[PDB]
Specification:
- The structure is a homotrimer of 458-residue chains.
- Chain A has 458 residues and is of the alpha+beta class.
- Chain A is 33% helix and 27% strand.
- In chain A, a hairpin with a 2-residue loop joins strand 2 and strand 3.
- The longest helix of chain A has 22 residues.
- Chain A starts with 11 loop residues before the first helix and ends in a 6-residue tail after the last strand.
- At the A-C interface, helix 4 and helix 8 of A face helix 9 of C.
- The complex binds 4,4'-Diisothiocyano-2,2'-stilbenedisulfonic acid (9 copies).
- The site of one 4,4'-Diisothiocyano-2,2'-stilbenedisulfonic acid (4DS) has 17 residues of chain B, from strand 2, strand 3, helix 6 and helix 13.
- Chains A, B, C: It comes from Homo sapiens (Human).
Chain lengths: 458, 458, 458
């Protein structure tokens, strides 16, 4: 009696799971929105910095109209390798943004010290890939927030460790691994040699220096006791346990709400795989919400949910889409896009400004939101699915994405727009205020920037 | 000198062979139509009963417009596992219908007793998959009929064993394996413990109870002597020998006639794989032909061929399609569909009724056809490719499919239609007769049913 | 710590490399056009002769409108096997044309003798595949020419060995391996038993007859010392080293210029794989350029580049495409096609004739081009990607392709066209001269042929 090979099955549920972290795939949340959960862990924020900045080059004539295809190929070649390192070291990739990613090792509180050592070694092996990247590490309390409606879901992680991992990675020169102050407090100081970072309490990792009897592979194996989903036994050859997910209509209904409809169309073999990689004209509306205390999920959770319900309603009317939601050092940020896969309708610009204003007015009156700031910028951006075969997400990358992000942070409390938007809108000039030029870290040649004042003086 | 791996090649001939049983793939029939062949074997009819009945749920809003995709994923997850069991135990899947399938073990007459034991063990392992299905078995003489024209072919199996395997499976409660009377007569009674089935000569299998020296794997190996196409030797790792078919234009011309054109388009990589899975509005015309003796191929074969030639001509004019032909307990049944893949033209309904009537009038005068009955029903049905990667077929599933089937059996001798068809047609009311309501085993809430009387009183 | 399998990655750069020989993939040429390089090697020209001639049959009704699909399946089944033999024996497939291919073993001059023995054994194993094909071999000096513009590149090999390998294969009856005179001069005469070929200095291989101590596998291993890209070590399981190419935007920009845009669309998953296999009406314009000395790259290179710049400009205006460039026994030949993938515009014929004439007038005044001859023929041709998964090219095959080729050689110095072109053009009759009928080796039933005289008497 024959025994044919049990082969890998790429069911639709597995294809959906590649877009999501274990944090969501293996969650089992209540239905209320917002939903909040509390835990401890180590976070790694890795950035292939400088990439977005150079992406303008893939529009150049030398790429012969295959710039998008070449960009996603070269980006994925490098990002995939980082992803695979994270996964083999037992981490969960939470989110991709631009040319950056955020990873989590969730563990019981008593094990933070040893897991920090695992994450440090991972980081150093990540740098080792590129000898021929900047990394920030944080550790401590983390909260999860899940928000959405009956057909869409989004998640965020929040708290001091999340705020920290950002600060840490901003400080890294190239090739550094930086630890947050709390990460450095909690870590196995006997193992790692560090330097001070001038005017900072964070530190830099110089070397990992294990004791005589130390064997990293045996240490790692011990650490796996505490990793719930590390592929093992019969499945030790897989990068993710999620590769083994079986059809389950209830679970697939829950997971599909996290993925955009155009991605699902691809998943369902109803659209060619190449259709979503493109260098496409869009308008970015980057919405930032600031709170008095952004580390307290129970305070900020309802407010984010309320803002989301309104944003999604305003976006719906124009086929805008939320591409991502991230925490920033200051606030919760919604990266919204007008002009995505087959959503290309006329007056994208006037509508984008009116949408922004509507969001601004509504969110300004939401209980607990202290400040709303919105940046609007328009031009050619890369859109595509970035990451590894087993862990990837649809992402937008471009100078206009980062300009919209920087505008909302450098011009808080108002709706701002770039010159393409201002000129294109053909709204009358007195709907705007021409703004002073600010030097914006990460940006140059911004062109004139404007505030969208609105239809009336007020 | 290198020796690179001989890799599996998915040639178009192999892709076509996945839609067909070994009975056809390895046949070598004459060109006459009808063609008839005679043999002996064991038949297994397996039904995941209740599924079709629940399929209405995949149209519900909770599935967020991916009902078809979720339905085919979950159905195939379960059906695939049954298919793989059948194939490993040496059976040939003949046909899929709805959430049911028919399998055959063809063997020389002297080996029926031992092959029944193999099929019994298979059936029990099939039930074992679902601890967390109903099976009927028959054995004896079987005839094959192949009918068609110069560009299309269809096959049927016929005879008392085929009639029996239906009766047997109708009697099974859930989780039963039922044997036909002849199967029970021919089987190894020392091996199997059975109960009587009240008011039936068929029996139910309680257990397989082998003797002391018995070793099922060694018994199975012996049985493989008699299985012409059991994958073996170098190919013992394959589910089907048909996976090894090589390009052969003559054979591919013959096999392609059994597959619908839209499936071939997919096979040829000229249509996306996802296009054929859909929850689509169609009109089912289910045609039943009854004979004085439906076990005699030489009598019924020419009549079925004659009926087929006319049906196919009438269907052609409106882009109706034959989806399947099955034997029923009473008669040969053609499952015809209007509105399939890209065949969506207006007045589907009036045309469907006129087509039905034309078929009714013509088939009624075919020598040897005793009664024609036709059921017409219209609404949302699932269409898609069901089964395993290596053995699958395009199938339609839905409450309207089963309503059309039950109408043709409970209202014999006339053309009947459902309320959607009647109301939609906007043919005048006196073209119809409103019918008494019958309780139809397998159905509820049918709505009013009508006879299509036709254009004249008569 | 897990170690998941390093799996084969089908990056876009690798997909592009399948369309190209190692000669180009691993080249590192200067940017000037023309570019010329000089080396030594053995050439194998293999033809599955008679195939093109029978291809008319795949339009017959018996193929039920899947003639193109069946043709490419059966052709690739056989061609793939030849390709795999060439690759395992260490050769580089340079080009596919019709049902023929050209392969090269490049080696240092001192090793020609031993490499000829390897190529002879390969050829005999190729014949061994088909017991149930004609091969010509040449050896000696070879020049490479690369020509093109800023966005397209083409290459040719040139010289006496290239002229020889053609002569050699023209002489082969079926099943022969013929050696050129120089190949026979350079080979290991102690190993091979040959016959004279009447009225020729080339010879035919009867047998390979190695000495007592000879072990072909050990001899082959020795020969691999001299094969730069033979897959080895960790990669000994691969057919080509090019399967291991990593993303490299500079290299991909260079390689993509050799591939047509519609093929790149497929590569990029932006068009279905099946779209390019078709039996399609086109017009072939086959352009032949003759030189006083076609073995001297430094003479003919600039002239071919000049002709190319003009051809490509004339083709551009009508969406004609260069499908291939080959050396012929006499001259350089450009196989140009009007009506390719989505390039189907009206008056294909008048435009094709005017294009031809423009090319004729311009190329006639290019320094060093002695004679220009152009054949124009129109009808149904097969287009598709022919070869192996790892080494394949887009090719056109058909009686009209070979008619255009034979016209340009049998009616040198003029633009000729077939009856379909002449009649279809509805240009006035005095734009043409009706030609005497020539018996053209490889052709019958040509229909009347015409010269395109042009708009004026002159
Ligand atoms: O029955 S429903 O389709 O409405 C359904 C609603 C749910 N709502 C929520 S929350 C969660 C699940 C769910 C259906 C599950 C199945 C539907 C069809 C199957 N068919 C087969 S073969 C098997 C399953 S199973 O997952 O229960 O095995
Ligand atoms: O590529 S694999 O089969 O290994 C695979 C592993 C995953 N592992 C996990 S967790 C998740 C997905 C996955 C395959 C994805 C696709 C494979 C073929 C497609 N053709 C089309 S359209 C589209 C997709 S899609 O999901 O990326 O859209
Ligand atoms: O653009 S980044 O790759 O740095 C990025 C990745 C994220 N996630 C992932 S995966 C989340 C946020 C994020 C960008 C953050 C900022 C963007 C603009 C700012 N302007 C000012 S002043 C400040 C910040 S901050 O949050 O870093 O303080
Ligand atoms: O020659 S025909 O295309 O008309 C033909 C008619 C048949 N009618 C019937 S019944 C059955 C087969 C058939 C053609 C077979 C081939 C056609 C092309 C091949 N080319 C190559 S390389 C090889 C074969 S083979 O199968 O004979 O090897
Ligand atoms: O999936 S496998 O390559 O193992 C395979 C085994 C079979 N074994 C046997 S017997 C038959 C078919 C088969 C593959 C089928 C497809 C693979 C990719 C496709 N892409 C598209 S459009 C479409 C098909 S199709 O044939 O299902 O249409
Ligand atoms: O619908 S089923 O899954 O039971 C089915 C599968 C088949 N094949 C496969 S694979 C072939 C037939 C078939 C349905 C048969 C009937 C459908 C309606 C009837 N109404 C009455 S009275 C009686 C029968 S019967 O033939 O079972 O007597
Ligand atoms: O920077 S450009 O895009 O203009 C460029 C021009 C060339 N012109 C020529 S000749 C050759 C290469 C080339 C760009 C190379 C890269 C572009 C983006 C990368 N991103 C990441 S992660 C990595 C590379 S790499 O190959 O240099 O590693
Ligand atoms: O098929 S393999 O993945 O082994 C492969 C090996 C190669 N080896 C080398 S060197 C080059 C290419 C190659 C795969 C090609 C494709 C695979 C899937 C496609 N789907 C679509 S559209 C399209 C292509 S394509 O490149 O042929 O267009
Ligand atoms: O058509 S073929 O398969 O023989 C062919 C394959 C090639 N390449 C590849 S891969 C390159 C050329 C080629 C055809 C050459 C000719 C075509 C028509 C001729 N008419 C006359 S007189 C003479 C020649 S010749 O060059 O063989 O003398």
């Amino acid at each position: 009696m024959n025994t044919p090979k049990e082969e890998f099955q790429d069911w639709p549920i597995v294809r959906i799971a590649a877009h999501l972290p274990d944090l969501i795939v293996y969650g089992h949340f209540s239905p209320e929105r917002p939903f909040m959960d509390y835990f401890d862990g180590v976070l790694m924020f890795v950035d292939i910095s400088g990439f977005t900045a150079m992406t303008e080059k893939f529009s150049s004539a030398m790429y012969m109209d295959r710039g998008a295809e070449q960009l996603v190929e070269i980006l994925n070649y490098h990002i995939s390798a980082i992803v695979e390192k994270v996964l083999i070291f037992g981490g969960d990739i939470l989110k991709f943004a631009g040319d950056a990613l955020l990873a989590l090792w969730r563990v019981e509180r008593k094990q933070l010290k040893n897991i920090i050592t695992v994450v440090i070694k991972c980081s150093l092996e990540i740098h080792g890939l590129f000898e021929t990247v900047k990394i920030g590490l944080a550790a401590g309390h983390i909260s999860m927030l899940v928000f959405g409606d009956e057909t869409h879901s989004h998640f965020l992680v929040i708290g001091q460790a999340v705020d920290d991992v950002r600060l840490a990675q901003n400080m890294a020169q190239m090739n550094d691994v930086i630890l947050s102050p709390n990460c450095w407090q909690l870590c196995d100081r006997s193992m790692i040699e560090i330097e001070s970072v001038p005017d900072q309490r964070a530190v830099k990792v110089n070397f990992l220096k294990p004791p005589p009897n130390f064997n990293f592979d045996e240490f790692f194996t011990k650490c796996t006791t505490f990793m719930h989903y590390y592929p093992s036994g019969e499945h030790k050859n897989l990068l993710r346990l999620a590769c083994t997910l079986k059809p389950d209509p209830e679970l697939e209904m829950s997971l599909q709400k996290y993925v955009m409809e155009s991605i699902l169309k691809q998943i369902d073999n109803k659209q060619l795989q190449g259709y979503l990689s493109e260098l496409r004209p869009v308008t970015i509306v980057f919405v930032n919400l600031m709170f008095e205390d952004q580390d307290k999920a129970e305070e900020i959770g309802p407010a984010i949910q309320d803002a989301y319900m309104h944003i999604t309603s305003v976006l719906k009317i124009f086929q805008g889409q939320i591409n991502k939601v991230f925490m920033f050092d200051k606030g919760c940020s919604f990266l919204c896009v007008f002009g995505f896969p087959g959503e290309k309708v006329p007056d994208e610009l006037t509508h984008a400004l009116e949408c922004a204003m509507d969001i601004f007015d509504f969110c300004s009156q939401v209980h607990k939101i202290q400040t709303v700031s919105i940046g609007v910028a328009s031009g050619i951006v890369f859109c595509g699915i970035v990451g590894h075969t087993v862990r990837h997400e649809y992402t937008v990358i471009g100078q206009k994405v980062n300009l919209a992000a920087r505008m909302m942070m450098y011009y808080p409390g108002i709706v701002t727009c770039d010159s393409v938007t201002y000129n294109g809108s053909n709204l009358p000039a007195y709907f705007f205020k021409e703004l002073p030029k600010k030097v914006m870290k990460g940006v140059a040649d911004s062109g004139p920037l404007y505030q969208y004042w609105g239809r009336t003086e007020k």
